[PDB]
Design a binder for this molecule. Structure first.
Ligand code: HEM
Ligand SMILES: [K+]
Length: 294
């Protein structure tokens, strides 16, 4: 099967203003629906949705990826690895209803960008142009990562997404948001206390907390700290591996570096598999509600 080329196609007549309006709608709803998940808000689940819809990509044949917006199809929607993401999708429904012109891929990815920025994270340049593809293009389940593995697994896994050591450690920093839910993944607990604030706390906790390898109620091992935080075996592997450890220490000691590196890696993640024409508009950098005085 010749590997497909997915060329970005700007939604007819749309420009920055249009997308800023969608961003604002998402941001306003994030502010409004703050009760979700014990007052954590929808920010974290939206970031996870953006990552999962993009993370199915395979550099070898360009299958999966954010372009097609295939999460809308049952096969992907029902992927066990996506348990819980239905919440993010339900949140996006009113947004898509108001702006029916935006593609699913653009909406899923924009939701992640909006959530990160609204949660005081770095600005993440974003490009429009993803086009909805048929149900038959939906990637099979099993392309997202397992959490009960080690550094070797993580390193190998991310090579399929064309991510190097630095990009992997930076991307994992997204765990500074939200928490694991036993019912969804078989893991329970937050990585950080301020889990709706995008900062480098994930790295600081990993390095400074006293972790104990314990078993949760789902009979799965996870690292727990007296402070009430947790780390998946894959998160902990970042301090077990010498190469990953140096980068963890770097981000734990440089907030700005983490922000810049995460911004680049997250945009790359959300753009994998997409060919942007030379005449395509430059990446958009949306203003937060706060910057707009809204
Ligand atoms: C080896 C890689 C990774 C593994 C094994 C992993 C695993 C997990 C697991 C098991 C959960 C809990 C889901 C639940 O129970 O609701 C989770 C949540 C989450 N992950 Fe990851 N993750 C990985 C990489 C990433 C990356 C690259 C990002 C994004 C840049 C990310 C963002 C999130 C966010 C924001 C949540 C919180 C969701 C919520 O609170 O609802 N993860 N991850
Ligand atoms: K945090």
């Amino acid at each position: 099967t010749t590997p497909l080329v997915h060329v970005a196609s700007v939604e007819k007549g749309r420009s920055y203003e249009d997308f800023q309006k969608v961003y604002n709608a998402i941001a306003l709803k994030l502010r409004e629906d703050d009760e979700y998940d014990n007052y954590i808000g929808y920010g974290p689940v939206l970031v996870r949705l953006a990552w999962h819809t993009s993370g199915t990509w395979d550099k070898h044949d360009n299958t999966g990826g954010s372009y097609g917006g295939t999460y809308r199809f049952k096969k992907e929607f029902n992927d066990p690895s996506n348990a819980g993401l239905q919440n993010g999708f339900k949140f996006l429904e009113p947004i898509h209803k108001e702006f029916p012109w935006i593609s699913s891929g653009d909406l899923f990815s924009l939701g992640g960008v909006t959530a990160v920025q609204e949660m005081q994270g770095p600005k993440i340049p974003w490009r429009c142009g993803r086009v909805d593809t048929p149900e038959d293009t939906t990637p099979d389940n099993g392309r997202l990562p397992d959490a009960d593995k080690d550094a070797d697994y993580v390193r190998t896994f991310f090579q399929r997404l064309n991510m190097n050591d630095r990009e992997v450690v930076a991307l994992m920093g997204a765990h500074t948001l939200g928490k694991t839910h036993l019912k969804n993944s078989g893991y329970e607990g937050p990585w950080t206390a301020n889990n709706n604030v995008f900062d480098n706390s994930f790295y600081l906790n990993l390095l400074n907390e006293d972790w104990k390898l314990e078993k949760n109620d789902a009979n799965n091992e996870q690292w727990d700290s007296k402070s009430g935080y947790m780390m998946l075996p894959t998160d902990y592997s970042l301090i077990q591996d010498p190469k990953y450890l140096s980068i963890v220490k770097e981000y734990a000691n440089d907030q700005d570096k983490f922000f810049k590196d995460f911004s680049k890696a997250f945009e790359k993640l959300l753009e994998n598999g997409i060919t942007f024409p030379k005449d395509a508009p430059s990446p958009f950098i949306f203003k937060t509600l706060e910057e707009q005085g809204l």
